[PDB]
Scaffold this active site. Structure first.
Site: not given
Ligand SMILES: Cc1cc2nc3c(=O)[nH]c(=O)nc-3n(C[C@H](O)[C@H](O)[C@H](O)COP(=O)(O)OP(=O)(O)OC[C@H]3O[C@@H](n4cnc5c(N)ncnc54)[C@H](O)[C@@H]3O)c2cc1C
Ligand SMILES: Cc1cc2nc3c(=O)[nH]c(=O)nc-3n(C[C@H](O)[C@H](O)[C@H](O)COP(=O)(O)OP(=O)(O)OC[C@H]3O[C@@H](n4cnc5c(N)ncnc54)[C@H](O)[C@@H]3O)c2cc1C
Ligand SMILES: O=c1ccn([C@H]2C[C@H](O)[C@@H](COP(=O)(O)O)O2)c(=O)[nH]1
Ligand SMILES: Cc1cc2nc3c(=O)[nH]c(=O)nc-3n(C[C@H](O)[C@H](O)[C@H](O)COP(=O)(O)OP(=O)(O)OC[C@H]3O[C@@H](n4cnc5c(N)ncnc54)[C@H](O)[C@@H]3O)c2cc1C
Ligand SMILES: Cc1cc2nc3c(=O)[nH]c(=O)nc-3n(C[C@H](O)[C@H](O)[C@H](O)COP(=O)(O)OP(=O)(O)OC[C@H]3O[C@@H](n4cnc5c(N)ncnc54)[C@H](O)[C@@H]3O)c2cc1C
Ligand SMILES: O=c1ccn([C@H]2C[C@H](O)[C@@H](COP(=O)(O)O)O2)c(=O)[nH]1
Ligand SMILES: O=c1ccn([C@H]2C[C@H](O)[C@@H](COP(=O)(O)O)O2)c(=O)[nH]1
Ligand SMILES: O=c1ccn([C@H]2C[C@H](O)[C@@H](COP(=O)(O)O)O2)c(=O)[nH]1
Lengths: 211, 209, 211, 215
Positions: A70-72, A78-79, A82, A139, A166
């Site tokens: 969830r920390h974007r 990740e392993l 599939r 799986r 966390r």
């Molecule tokens: C005790 C606890 C309970 C929780 N319960 C739930 C639940 O019930 N349901 C649920 O869905 N999740 C839940 N979460 C997850 C939570 O909502 C967040 O997704 C997660 O904690 C990541 O936090 P973050 O967005 O601050 O971090 P990140 O995604 O790492 O973002 C880091 C920081 O960058 C910023 N940021 C990144 N992307 C954006 C954006 N697109 N727009 C604006 N600012 C951005 C914000 O300032 C953010 O603080 C829970 C977390 C905790 C610790």
């Molecule tokens: C067929 C298929 C197989 C996959 N297999 C695996 C697997 O084996 N293991 C696994 O872990 N995941 C797997 N994934 C997930 C994949 O690794 C990506 O995390 C996922 O497709 C999200 O893509 P994204 O990063 O382009 O999108 P987002 O995360 O939404 O980002 C969108 C765009 O923003 C950019 N961006 C956002 N954050 C950053 C950053 N921190 N640094 C640089 N650019 C950034 C990039 O330009 C990206 O295109 C798979 C996905 C597909 C479709």
């Molecule tokens: O097609 C895929 C395969 C993997 N993953 C990402 C999601 C999980 O974080 C991790 C493992 O997913 P599975 O291969 O088990 O679906 O990698 C995807 O996003 N798309």
């Protein structure tokens, strides 16, 4: 590599680190040092801390990964379930996990009922695979306590946000445990920033009690 | 490690730090040559996430109009020289006469260059005068032109870097940031040769690399 | 809704997706006790629900202001191109009142005048260079940082509250403070419950509690 | 707009800001159909993607956890999911139809695959409920639950990050289950932003399914 064991089969291992406390200092000056980190932390100048970066290798149950991912503001790899045959590794809570809740059955039986389902689910998984069911479908019967592994690359700012959320009593106990190990590595590599963080910016409760 | 490339008349790109190498992507793809083959495969198919685990820190001295374009790249970290609190140095990008190559000009390129120097000098002297008068620096500096040099630290991973090179290592981008993008590319190449070759071969959308 | 800022600037609302209930729906994952939930989310730092409220602003601001503004990475921008447009004779000239509290060696009205002089000589040099056949992308480098630019800004309520924490605050440059005050007013109008809870619980700045 | 997916899932449109013209106005920085439609194609063709970020969607999506976990790897979007630590989880799980395994040579009838999957689900769920009645906390009781458990979440994504999503998921290399969801995302995007979805497909889309399957 610094490797800390978490839960029954989990871990957090440090793969790589870019920089240290002085990386934040030079970025802040664009170029006394420990006082500058305290200063930055105290006033909320968080951006210089983005120039310190870590890569961790983490083995965790899926229910913990799910929360973690969830920390974007971070990068994850990740392993793949599939295409990889998944290993028989599952988080089985210790009896002490249920300390503080009044239960109907003993905590050893709870631990036993979890183990039971896990074994049934994994057998089924293996039977499906053997019958020619694709791994990606087979799986889906595996429980949320299955262990997965992933790489996590995250900068000190996002890491500190992770620890605010966390390494805190409101987070599920299992991820708390992972966050404590993250904090331990963070502290070893960036002691000035870690101590300043705890002193001025840290929003959680546990890292101020758990040394 | 450490590299420095001079750009324009007084600018530079300096590599401050790196995390990882081509194997950092490989390790990540696999969650740990067959390895060089993997990097090309990842590049070919746009499996770009593995390259996020390679990270650079740069220290850049560039004109404000270059930095303004640069800082549009949001997937990165920046820290920049503060004009609100520091007394800013007399350093400005003066184009050489060669910069106007291609363009039939009414006045000889040297005079263009000299006209730029003069307005710059006048602006800077006014800035200094206002500062001496007790005008806050944050106000005084607003007369300074877009060709004033600023400095900044830039932390960027290989994936965001390749996006940057796609856009700025390209003829449609302004010549001045193109020159910086060429320095960024050369340092990237030194530190991650496999990834960079694969990039050029498979993913690179620009036209000057 | 449009608010004039500085001598020739402004902030206008182009669009908004949602309202306070948009956050409530998100937090509940469905579709006063609603307003109690907004205050609950805000008090506890549950900020993600507010990401599902989104604004688009049209802003006319001097370049020095826009550069501070564009540091806010969690948002979307599109700005006027100066590489291909003939740039408009519009510059932020400070009022004499801008130097109140500062004891200066020349009158504030004279500071103001010296600023317009440079603006005028710089713009005239730019025009001269253009008329000579110098490409616009080169000629514009002589233009001062107080040149007005325009951009579209799309930002969610969460990133917007971060922006107001940092910019609706006296440590920020007065000029951007004025813009932040306008953002806040449009925010307040569209999402009064969130804005009110933000001020009560989460807002870190100072000036919004004063004005 | 609500489209059913899989056996108990759906993609529902909650809200939208903007339309094709929101990208045009951003691109021009300015608050004529053929001219506007031309602009959209030129942006998409030359990779000037940023104007499309000014269009924004909110979906409500119900999907199995193994699908949600793929989806949530899209970090340029916002997410709020239902909480398993504190809500009593509903008995809803994805059970593949026998047609999901047509054209895999299996040693058992695909009906038995369904029965096998359905069987463990029932056991896991029963164990879960058993644990809850015992006083075991939900956060711990739910870890026995399988990955086909249905979850619900809110997703807020801009048309740019949405088009990335489609390149990667509306594509045969993605797991068939997420494909199905992406086709629903695509039909809704198409309804709300026809010119951008069409330009996208003509100029920018790298997946394979949206050019074969209408909408
Ligand atoms: C005790 C606890 C309970 C929780 N319960 C739930 C639940 O019930 N349901 C649920 O869905 N999740 C839940 N979460 C997850 C939570 O909502 C967040 O997704 C997660 O904690 C990541 O936090 P973050 O967005 O601050 O971090 P990140 O995604 O790492 O973002 C880091 C920081 O960058 C910023 N940021 C990144 N992307 C954006 C954006 N697109 N727009 C604006 N600012 C951005 C914000 O300032 C953010 O603080 C829970 C977390 C905790 C610790
Ligand atoms: C067929 C298929 C197989 C996959 N297999 C695996 C697997 O084996 N293991 C696994 O872990 N995941 C797997 N994934 C997930 C994949 O690794 C990506 O995390 C996922 O497709 C999200 O893509 P994204 O990063 O382009 O999108 P987002 O995360 O939404 O980002 C969108 C765009 O923003 C950019 N961006 C956002 N954050 C950053 C950053 N921190 N640094 C640089 N650019 C950034 C990039 O330009 C990206 O295109 C798979 C996905 C597909 C479709
Ligand atoms: O097609 C895929 C395969 C993997 N993953 C990402 C999601 C999980 O974080 C991790 C493992 O997913 P599975 O291969 O088990 O679906 O990698 C995807 O996003 N798309
Ligand atoms: C020749 C040229 C001319 C230009 N002209 C103009 C102009 O006239 N006006 C103007 O304003 N700008 C202009 N730009 C800048 C351009 O619009 C981008 O802001 C800049 O190139 C940064 O690119 P990026 O968004 O791809 O990189 P980053 O902003 O670092 O993003 C990296 C990647 O992550 C993704 N991403 C990051 N944030 C988001 C998000 N919020 N939503 C969806 N996806 C996201 C995208 O996949 C993106 O490719 C120009 C650029 C070039 C090369
Ligand atoms: C009084 C004042 C003085 C300043 N002085 C300077 C100066 O001298 N030099 C200078 O360079 N800047 C300066 N800044 C700008 C400041 O450092 C930030 O760049 C700006 O305020 C944007 O803040 P942000 O990063 O929180 O916002 P955004 O960039 O929108 O980010 C929003 C939130 O998301 C998160 N986030 C987004 N991307 C990342 C990431 N890649 N890593 C970790 N977390 C991330 C953070 O949690 C952040 O709070 C100043 C600002 C103020 C108010
Ligand atoms: O109050 C400030 C000071 C600095 N900066 C950022 C913006 C620029 O990228 C750089 C220098 O800005 P000035 O101090 O020159 O305004 O630091 C801000 O965002 N806000
Ligand atoms: O090649 C370009 C043209 C424009 N811009 C962005 C940066 C500014 O935010 C705005 C206007 O830049 P100029 O065209 O004035 O350089 O658009 C770029 O990033 N690169
Ligand atoms: O403490 C928590 C609770 C929930 N979630 C997120 C992760 C999932 O996306 C969703 C539901 O998590 P569970 O409550 O089911 O663990 O919300 C967290 O990140 N941390």
């Amino acid at each position: 590599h610094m490797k800390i064991d978490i839960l029954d089969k989990g871990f957090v291992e440090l793969v790589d680190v870019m920089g240290n406390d002085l990386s934040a200092v030079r970025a802040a000056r664009v170029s006394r040092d420990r006082h500058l980190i305290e200063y930055l932390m105290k006033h909320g100048h968080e951006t210089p801390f983005e120039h310190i970066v870590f890569t961790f290798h983490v083995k965790a149950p899926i229910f913990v990964a799910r929360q973690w991912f969830r920390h974007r503001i971070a990068s994850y790899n990740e392993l793949c379930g599939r295409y990889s045959k998944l290993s028989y590794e599952f988080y089985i809570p210790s009896p002490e996990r249920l300390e503080g809740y009044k239960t109907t059955i003993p905590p050893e039986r709870v631990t036993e009922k979890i183990s039971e389902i896990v074994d049934k689910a994994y057998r089924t998984y293996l039977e499906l695979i053997e019958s020619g069911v694709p791994r990606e479908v087979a799986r889906i019967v595996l429980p949320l306590n299955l262990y997965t592994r992933f790489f996590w690359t995250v900068n000190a700012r996002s890491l500190m946000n992770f620890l605010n959320l966390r390494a805190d009593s409101h987070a599920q106990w299992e991820i708390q445990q992972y966050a404590l190990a993250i904090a331990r590595i963070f502290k070893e590599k960036c002691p000035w920033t870690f101590e300043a963080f705890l002193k001025y910016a840290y929003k959680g409760d546990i890292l101020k009690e758990v040394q």
